[PDB]
Amino acid sequence: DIPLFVQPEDFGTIQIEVLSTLYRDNEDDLSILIAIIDRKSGKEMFKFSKSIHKVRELDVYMKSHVPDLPLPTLPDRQLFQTLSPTKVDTRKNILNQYYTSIFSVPEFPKNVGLKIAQFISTDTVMTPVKDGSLLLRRPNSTWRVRYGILRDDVLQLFDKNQLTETIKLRQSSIELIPNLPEDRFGTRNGFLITEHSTKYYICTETSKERELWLSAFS
């Protein structure tokens, strides 16, 4: 066997939270970061990372070994084709609904329950001023994944751990971009930083993350 972090009979005692679908794993590919939480304590026990391909693989296994029991539906493949903020926001919510339903099924067959347990017991992620994954556009205007670090009153953006942008907040102005009506770029949870000029369009994965980032800007 491979060591199990949570026994299949104890799937009911955990909550899941899909934290991101822009996480860079050990091989530096975009993957899905998932947190496993103890229900009674509310403490985050561990995190793990899976590519969308691995997610569909386990899904394929389940459809075939439990055909008679209803199972949730994965996000569509089109949500992972052209990178846009509105798709990133949506597919994270569907994945949250998906894995909440999985660990809410009362009983799985012994083989299927072990496979799910092995799934969450691999690709473990250990992670210990504001930061987070961001989506960046410039005024021929595609989006690109960036990792933002707020240093003092200066924002730093990295592309695969390489400084590609550096921003002064004292020189710049900030404004929210309304989610609606949806523009021709799929902007969502977005805001504009105009550094004195130059304009950077930045979106977060959730609307809460936009709230948290603006407060860091203050």
From Swiss-Prot:
Residues 129-218 form the PH domain. It is found in: Cytoplasm. It comes from the Eukaryota. GTPase-activating protein (GAP) for CDC42 and less efficiently for RHO1. Negative regulator of the pheromone-response pathway through the STE20 protein kinase. Present with 752 molecules/cell in log phase SD medium. This is GTPase-activating protein BEM3. It comes from Saccharomyces cerevisiae (strain ATCC 204508 / S288c) (Baker's yeast).
